[PDB]
From a paper:
Most kinases in this group, including those in the mammalian Ste20-like (MST) kinase family, are Thr selective (Miller et al., 2008), while members of the p21-activated kinase ([name]) family are Ser selective (Rennefahrt et al., 2007). Here we show that a residue located in the kinase activation segment, which we term the “DFG+1” residue, acts as a major determinant for serine-threonine phosphorylation site specificity. To understand the structural basis for how the DFG+1 residue controls phosphoacceptor specificity, we determined the X-ray cocrystal structures of WT and F461V mutant [name] catalytic domains in complex with consensus peptide substrates incorporating both their favored and disfavored phosphorylation site residues (PAKtide-S and PAKtide-T). As previously observed for WT [name] in the absence of bound peptide (Eswaran et al., 2007; Ha et al., 2012), in each of the structures [name] is observed in the active state conformation with the activation loop phosphorylated on residue Ser474.
Interestingly, the cocrystallized ATP analog was only visible in the electron density for the structure of the WT [name] complex with PAKtide-S. Both structures of WT [name] in complex with the optimal substrate, PAKtide-S or PAKtide-S(L), are highly similar, with small differences observed in the conformation of several side chains within the bound peptide and some crystal packing-induced conformational differences C-terminal to the phosphoacceptor residue. The bound peptide has a nearly identical backbone conformation, and, importantly, the residues most strongly selected by the kinase (the P-2 Arg and the P0 Ser residues [Rennefahrt et al., 2007; Zhu et al., 2005]) are observed in very similar orientations. As found in other structures of Ser-Thr kinases with bound peptide substrates (Brown et al., 1999; Bullock et al., 2005; Madhusudan et al., 1994; Yang et al., 2002), in both structures the Ser hydroxyl points toward the ATP binding site and is engaged in a network of polar contacts with conserved residues in the kinase catalytic loop. Both structures therefore show the [name]-peptide complex in a conformation apparently competent for phosphate transfer to occur. The DFG+1 Phe residue in these WT [name] structures is positioned within 4Å of the Ser phosphoacceptor β-carbon and oriented perpendicular to the substrate peptide backbone. This conformation for the DFG+1 Phe would preclude the additional methyl group of a Thr phosphoacceptor due to steric hindrance. Taken together, these structures provide a likely explanation for why WT [name], and by extension other kinases with a DFG+1 Phe residue, is selective for Ser at the phosphorylation site.
Author numbering:
A (entry chain B): -4 to 1
B (entry chain A): 300 to 589
Write the structure that this text describes.
């Protein structure tokens, strides 16, 4: 459930 | 090479140190590229936001040039205003407009938006994208976390750190960029892509506004990406909770073939947007009011 950008 | 880059940035940013004119820095957010503080302008008592990004902690340092120039050169009613940028020790600091209503994520994870509210958000975002895309700017990280609000419910696009430009000489981008659950299928497939990727990501945000989360959100990111790449467009968890108008709109965004996906310019004419409320209709959704 991670919202971090790549 | 870090020293090499610090020197390069110094040539592009404003001279000086905003610590000379700002007081009472308080951290309000943690991003993928750094942190965001509120600060008080000593002379005015006005509040600003300060995004601080450590040059040593970036995957691609050269992307920081987006933080220096995009907000400053591509201004719009629905895009966060930037004031100044500075090199402060090992960090790039951008002093920008404070969006005191916070991020759309805090609303979508805590309440249910009606279609007047969803349409108001979509209209504001599409107005920004139509202008950016006409100038060849692709945002590449559209999601609720990138949409910020004023106290009076105005909606603004933020976080251009990962954007890119297309033009006649560089008609498509190739970089793997974005947030896994929101990424366009052609981008995941590593095909050359354009502004269309932002429209797909907007469709995923519409699903956030309806369902509270993007599709496959409980899957590991890599697995979610495989599923986006390989599967039919993702479906709403609750189709009965959306009008045929909102379904028809979404059907123009979540199109696998980028050539058949609606453009921002085209979507501004969609009958779903006729439902958009004024910024006031957004106000009661925010934490300070609900
Ligand atoms: N101008 C602003 N006003 C108010 N809050 C902000 C502002 N900019 C960023 N934030 C908050 O700080 C978080 C991180 O900023 P963001 O621009 O997403 O950084 P990132 O490193 O690119 N990922 C956001 O998700 C917002 O909650
Ligand atoms: Mg972010
Ligand atoms: Mg970012």
């Amino acid at each position: 459930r991670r919202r971090r950008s790549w | 090479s870090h020293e090499q880059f610090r020197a390069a940035l110094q040539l592009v940013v404003d001279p000086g140190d905003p610590r000379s004119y700002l007081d009472n820095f308080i951290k309000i957010g943690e991003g993928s590229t750094g942190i965001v503080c509120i600060a008080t302008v000593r002379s005015s008592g006005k509040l600003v936001a300060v995004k601080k990004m450590d040059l040593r902690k970036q995957q691609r340092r050269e992307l920081l040039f987006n933080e220096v120039v995009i907000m400053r050169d591509y201004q719009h009613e629905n895009v966060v205003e930037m004031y100044n940028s500075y090199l402060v020790g090992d960090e790039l600091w951008v002093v920008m407009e404070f969006l005191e209503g916070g991020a759309l994520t805090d609303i979508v994870t805590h309440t249910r938006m009606n279609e007047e509210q969803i349409a108001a958000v979509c209209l504001a975002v599409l107005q920004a994208l139509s202008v950016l895309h006409a100038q060849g700017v692709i945002h590449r990280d559209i999601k609720s976390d990138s949409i910020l609000l004023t106290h009076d419910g105005r909606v603004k696009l933020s976080d251009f750190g990962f954007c890119a430009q297309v033009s006649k000489e560089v008609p498509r981008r190739k970089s793997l960029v974005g947030t896994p659950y929101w990424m366009a299928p052609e981008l995941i497939s590593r095909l050359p892509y354009g502004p269309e990727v932002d429209i797909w990501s907007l469709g995923i945000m519409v699903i956030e506004m309806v369902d509270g989360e993007p599709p496959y959100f409980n899957e590991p990111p890599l697995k979610a990406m495989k599923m986006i790449r390989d599967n039919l467009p993702p479906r709403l968890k609750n189709l009965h909770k959306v009008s045929p108008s909102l379904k028809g709109f979404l059907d123009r965004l979540l199109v696998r073939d980028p050539a058949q996906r609606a453009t921002a310019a085209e979507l501004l004419k969609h009958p779903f947007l006729a439902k958009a409320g004024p910024p006031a209709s957004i106000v009661p959704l925010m934490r300070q009011n609900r």
